[PDB]
Design a protein around this ligand. Structure first.
Ligand SMILES: *P(=O)(O)OCC(C)(C)[C@@H](O)C(=O)NCCC(=O)NCCS[C@H](CS(=O)(=O)NC[C@H]1O[C@@H](n2cnc3c(N)ncnc32)[C@H](O)[C@@H]1O)c1ccccc1O
Ligand SMILES: *P(=O)(O)OCC(C)(C)[C@@H](O)C(=O)NCCC(=O)NCCS[C@H](CS(=O)(=O)NC[C@H]1O[C@@H](n2cnc3c(N)ncnc32)[C@H](O)[C@@H]1O)c1ccccc1O
Lengths: 606, 611
């Protein structure tokens, strides 16, 4: 029925024979516990039993059937980190419908994009979301995508109230999930491409993803999991994420964001033993502790998952040191292929590598530029196929052609290298995609918006280092009439895109490399940047800038003044000597101190 | 004979009977090796055998005897980290003369001070030192201390050349060291007082200090020691320091300063296995490694001594981690009493404690304010007597009265606490003394110089925190006509004092606490400051322009926002925002991330902080 790329007959056989595809519905995850009175979800003050959760799902599905939603249809769901998300998810699974779980941070243009490829018969959104405070964008939206028939809204005492359908009990309704080898729902790809590109996941492949993730991370009835990153992403969903907790009878604790202020209290209060984060939030947490939060509220936490973005060995090491729990690096994509470091792994592999695939039948090779297998120390493009990795994007034949080699191996656009032990390390990136706090940003998607501006001739979006976010977006523009970053960010916001897509820096420049096709050449530009970057002071005035912080803030010296009289201490001086010796190697401590004036030291750095 | 406070007869007996005092001259350290051809000292490109070192000393001593220096007299020596220091020391020991080894950093006022108490018959200095470049200060100096008869200078091509006397061989010459229980030389306390106070050390007590230090640190002929901190201080001299290396037949490698740039090459080139540092140099070294120095030049180094100043457990732990050798904390004073952590000690004790005394007969207690002993966990003033700890300062009866209780126990002015295991931890300080990179600075000595200035009415010197130096001097003044730090540092410099005594910060204030006696009660001064400062640590933006100052660095440098603009349009990212919310919640506890971001303008956030 729904049109996805299937697996070669031969693979569908090996995957069932090898036990990976159990041909069970994803609903079976919540169904197992249908009779349990233990707590599945804690959202704020509310707590739901598995019985209640599964019941709510039956109700909402029943109520939706009554509103004339037929199996085979698609939906568009935008819900935040709130229980109604998990309810809606299972309700839609029980009906036979395939939703797209949209990020709550998404906006006008993203939602439009999704609804156009999906042709949704159902819309579920939240009135606390800016687009849904009023019914105007709402009304405009339903008319523009005509397929939409039913609409339910969270936080609405009004007509379309979602809670009404959730609490209206069940009829002669029985579940009708789609077949195990038929599409279950759609996941969102981390953008490489301007038109948003969806990922179909069948009950079979997705369920394996979750089961095997539970085995590896040791989730059990005991697991109390804090889900503070966006709940709708594949990571906090399947890896093992909240669904993995549900399969195992554990407890999911939802939180609106991952702020130490919000989370710390919840981890102690609910005795949380595991949680998943992205590197920027780990930085935030470690610092919040140093800034006087009590390392003791976090004492119940025995496991910290970190993934979605490059995690430095420096930062990884700080986790068990300052927080005092075990680290597991998770490297996965919405398309398939999650790599974990194991819990019984050595501290060497856990701090330095990204681990290895969750499946023995996950195939990974390292590829060179023409497409050739490299040995195992060598760096190249990551290729993989497998039992939970998909065979192509939904209704996107154009892109599918470039994303898969002739053998069905997907390419993530990641540069990796493999250990002699078989562990993967993320070396770099062969894609134009920016990874910002672990939110993917498609460079071309944003360039195309920039080109909608009258004064923009050529546009290029590249990543750039940030100690905290880990990467930030920087837009390089060639302009008719000069443009200021504010105006760009403002212009783009008016285009109705997610707030984190707005560039963190904008640099107008005299020219940009153009390739035969008309787009800026990213390889090039990336080179004539990273070169300029890789350093000791330029102007005598640049040397003053370096010295001043080392003296008494109280006064400023004349270039010929003795800097000791200004409070510069011999140790800071020795260091300055060391830093400058790496350029003029005759400079030592003694030489600097023999005549310590700015004049003297400038004559030396000449 | 020279006038020092002796040990009670009962103790001199126990200390000989227990083997501590061997009644041998300190020269015996160099004498043992007089026939050895192995290398005692490497100074730059020069290398001296024990035979040569001992010989040079016999020559310089003989040459000095010829110039009329009689046993019993005193000297003033100012020499840096160079071999001629060690030669001069033993030369003067062989004559029977007791020198003061002055720091090379010392200047006009310090040297005057020393020569006044000592009444030196002999002056030995270096022409590379600013005061001795020319003959100007030297002439003024000898007239103004008339006791001085002979003068020898390092790097003097002229008549006073020291090298000449060092190389002029020995006539009929025998050493006439002073008797083991008589004074050998003088050491400098950093001093708690404004007149410099000298510490007499007898051959007996000082030699013990060295022997027992060698045993504990296991120096042997294999020990190859880099002496980069000032060579004349008790630490790099006796603990075990260069003399400990000489006793053991090891090799001492001299270096002018302890910079990673100078030292790293020397440790590799000479295969140095041990060296002593102060906490600020350890920071400098650890960072130099991170900044791209190869951890491999330091590979021969099996032991790193760190002392002289508080060494944080964070820093201590980094040593074996990043440098990869063993740490030994050393907490001694020039007056006696060195505490080591042992080499076989646990990593717990080595990182957290300062170790315990090098002698079983070292006595340590702790005292509340009455002088009564505190129980075996409590914090209080450190009291000690012992076989190598002196019984009083040289010709300073006034101070001696306050530095010793009636039982002969010296008080270091340190606040310590003792482990159930008996290990000492330095808790804090009483003495009004500033410890700057581990150079002691007497607060009163500097105050009295500040009062020499016309515009200064009341003066107070206190310590202050510094991440790197560990402590810096800050001078609080009450002034007639307003003074700027530069003018103070310059004024003080002209007073002829060591460069590190110049205050790192100067604050002019409207008033200072004065006690019934007339000088700043530094005790209130210390609290008025305690609070002003700990009120501003949890401090949050004062006013709306102070809040702008905090936000701007978080946005694009490119533009500035109007108070009502949305700050996200200016590049402020949700993570930094969460953090700002956290810091502000500690004052208004209703503030979370969500609230900040609902309306992220400077106006909005100001309305929230004025509540
Ligand atoms: P403000 O904006 O309010 O807040 C900032 C903050 C807190 C960071 C906020 O943005 C936030 O909450 N962020 C969370 C980000 C997040 O939830 N990320 C989940 C990503 S879902 C991911 C699949 S993917 O396709 O989107 N990513 C695939 C690509 O990601 C790269 N990548 C993944 N893991 C990596 C590791 N470990 N190292 C290096 N790169 C990594 C890679 O390039 C890949 O192609 C996902 C993550 C984990 C497991 C499974 C999946 O599917
Ligand atoms: P620029 O100025 O060119 O360079 C800066 C730099 C490198 C810091 C420079 O000044 C420098 O080289 N400094 C080295 C200082 C130094 O050599 N110090 C040795 C001093 S001799 C010391 C005994 S004392 O009487 O001088 N001081 C005694 C007091 O010291 C405190 N204290 C000692 N040890 C301590 C430890 N381990 N922890 C905490 N406090 C400590 C205490 O207040 C005591 O009363 C000495 C030190 C070690 C061993 C033996 C002796 O004699």
């Amino acid at each position: 029925s729904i049109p996805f790329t299937r697996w070669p007959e031969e693979f569908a056989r090996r995957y069932r024979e090898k036990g990976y595809w159990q041909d069970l519905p994803l609903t079976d995850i919540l169904t197992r516990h249908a009779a349990s009175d233990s707590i599945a979800v804690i959202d704020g003050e509310r707590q739901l039993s598995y019985r209640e959760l599964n019941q709510a799902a039956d109700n909402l599905a029943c109520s939706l059937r009554r509103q004339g939603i037929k199996p085979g249809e698609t939906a568009l769901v935008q819900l935040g980190n709130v229980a109604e998300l998990y309810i809606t998810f299972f309700a839609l699974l029980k009906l036979g419908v395939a939703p797209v779980l949209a990020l709550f941070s998404h906006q006008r243009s993203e939602l439009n994009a999704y609804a156009s490829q999906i042709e949704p018969a159902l819309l579920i959104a939240d009135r606390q979301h800016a687009l849904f405070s009023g019914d105007d964008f709402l009304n405009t939206f339903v008319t523009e995508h005509s397929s939409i028939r039913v609409v339910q809204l969270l936080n609405d005492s009004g007509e379309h109230n979602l809670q009404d359908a959730i609490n209206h009990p069940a009829e002669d309704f029985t579940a009708t999930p789609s077949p195990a080898d038929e599409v279950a729902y759609f996941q969102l790809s981390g953008g490489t491409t301007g038109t948003p590109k969806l990922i179909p996941r069948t009950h079979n492949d997705y369920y394996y993803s979750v089961r095997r993730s539970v085995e590896i991370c040791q989730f059990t009835q005991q697991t109390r999991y804090l889900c503070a990153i966006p709940a709708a992403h594949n990571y906090a969903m399947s890896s093992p994420g909240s669904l993995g907790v549900f399969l195992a009878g554990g407890t999911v604790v939802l939180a609106a964001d991952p702020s130490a202020t919000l989370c710390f209290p919840l981890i102690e209060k609910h005795q949380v033993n595991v949680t998943a984060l992205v590197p920027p939030a780990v930085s935030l947490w470690l610092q919040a502790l140093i800034e006087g939060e009590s390392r003791a509220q976090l004492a119940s936490l025995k496991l910290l998952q970190v993934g979605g973005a490059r995690l430095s060995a420096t930062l990884a090491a700080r986790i068990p040191a300052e927080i005092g729990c075990q680290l597991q690096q998770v490297f996965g994509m919405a398309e398939g292929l999650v790599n974990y470091t194991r819990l019984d792994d050595s501290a060497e592999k856990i701090i330095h590598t990204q681990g290895y695939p969750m499946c023995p039948d996950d195939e990974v090779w390292v590829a060179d530029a023409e497409g050739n297998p490299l040995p195992q120390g060598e760096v190249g493009r990551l290729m993989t196929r497998g039992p939970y990795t998909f065979r192509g994007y939904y209704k996107s034949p154009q892109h599918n052609a470039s994303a898969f080699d002739a053998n069905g191996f997907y390419c993530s656009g990641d540069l990796i290298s493999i250990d002699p032990e078989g562990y993967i390390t993320v070396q770099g990136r062969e894609k134009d995609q920016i990874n910002r706090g672990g939110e993917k940003i498609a460079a071309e998607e944003i360039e195309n918006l920039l080109l909608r501006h009258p004064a923009v001739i050529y546009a290029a979006l590249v990543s750039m280092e940030d100690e905290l976010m880990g990467e930030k977006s920087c837009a390089y523009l060639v302009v008719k009439e000069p443009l200021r970053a504010v105006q760009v960010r403002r212009f783009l916001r008016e285009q109705g895109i997610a707030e984190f897509k707005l560039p963190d820096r904008v640099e107008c420049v005299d020219s940009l490399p153009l390739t035969a096709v008309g787009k800026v050449d990213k390889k090039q530009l990336r080179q004539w940047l990273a070169s300029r970057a890789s350093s000791i002071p330029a102007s005598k005035a640049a040397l003053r800038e370096v010295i001043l912080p080392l003296l008494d803030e109280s006064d400023e010296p004349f270039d010929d003044d003795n800097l000791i009289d200004y409070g510069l201490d011999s140790v800071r001086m020795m260091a300055l000597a060391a830093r400058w010796r790496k350029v003029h190697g005759d400079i030592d401590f003694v030489m600097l101190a023999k005549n310590p004036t700015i004049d003297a030291w400038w004559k030396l750095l000449s």
